[PDB]
Amino acid sequence: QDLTVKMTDLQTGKPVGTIELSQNKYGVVFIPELADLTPGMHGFHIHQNGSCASSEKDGKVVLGGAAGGHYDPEHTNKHGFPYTDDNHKGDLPALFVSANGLATNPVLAPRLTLKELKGHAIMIHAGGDNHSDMPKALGGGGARVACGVIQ
Amino acid sequence: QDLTVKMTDLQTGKPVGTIELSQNKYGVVFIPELADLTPGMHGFHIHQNGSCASSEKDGKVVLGGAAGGHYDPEHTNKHGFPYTDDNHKGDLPALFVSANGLATNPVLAPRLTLKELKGHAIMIHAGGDNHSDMPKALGGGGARVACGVIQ
Numbered sequence A, B: 001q002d003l004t005v006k007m008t009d010l011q012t013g014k015p016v017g018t019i020e021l022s023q024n025k026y027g028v029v030f031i032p033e034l035a036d037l038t039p040g041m042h043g044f045h046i047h048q049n050g051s052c053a054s055s056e057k058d059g060k061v062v063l064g065g066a067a068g069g070h071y072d073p074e075h076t077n078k079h080g081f082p083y084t085d086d087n088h089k090g091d092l093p094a095l096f097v098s099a100n101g102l103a104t105n106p107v108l109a110p111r112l113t114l115k116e117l118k119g120h121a122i123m124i125h126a127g128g129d130n131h132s133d134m135p136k137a138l139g140g141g142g143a144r145v146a147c148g149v150i151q
């Protein structure tokens, strides 16, 4: 009953690994098994649409823009922590990438359930995430680098 | 009703910052505000005794050995994840240290409560933590580098 999600690099078009999702007494667990990522902490979020295609914006291209914004079932219109209820239910803890470019440190999302995740897409950004909309919106994750649809 | 914990470097004897503890619907939140630490992921645990003094072992010195082993109220005798019940209730998520040596990424402990933490000590190790006793016990955190008693 556990889920496996294939992740692809939006830039190169090549796969960077897989993320396994599981449900437990305390929430959903995201177990990463990725590679070819830049070291550091990465913005890690569940997005609205179940797609990783591109989108257009004022004449420019947005890799993984079809996924839309962050998963916000309660229409909170705010970005925040994984343990605060007044923000995107899709706000996951940041994803850590080792010096060798690997990601295998599991993360927990207390406000989520497996059933509701299907049809949505997991997203990995280039910048980090300070879990706020200040001083940079959406935690400063910036561009989208890796993406995967949860089927 | 929130707690502030002073942390000291066991080696140099100098303070490296403070960690703020708070309680919320989903557990205890550890908000770090440290510095002078080596980049990477660090083993982060709550230990048994409320002390950071040294201890002796077979003729050798153990910095922060007086704190004892990991907090294990249920006497599970196993090291594991922060979201599994059959292991040290004191198993916290690993602590991330930036390239500039700062630690400010908050962490959540679902199985803990503030009241029970007092009298214990927060510990920071040199190695990481793979949340298991294999292939290295206690997640491979090795030596203790920073410590703080929760009063």
Ligand SMILES: [Cu+2]
Pocket: A043, A044, A045, A046, A047, A070, A123, A125, A141
């Ligand atoms: Cu995102």
Ligand SMILES: [Cu+2]
Pocket: B043, B044, B045, B046, B047, B070, B123, B125, B141
């Ligand atoms: Cu420890």
Ligand SMILES: [Zn+2]
Pocket: A045, A070, A078, A079, A080, A088, A090, A091, A138
């Ligand atoms: Zn968000």
Ligand SMILES: [Zn+2]
Pocket: B045, B070, B078, B079, B080, B088, B090, B091, B138
């Ligand atoms: Zn432990």
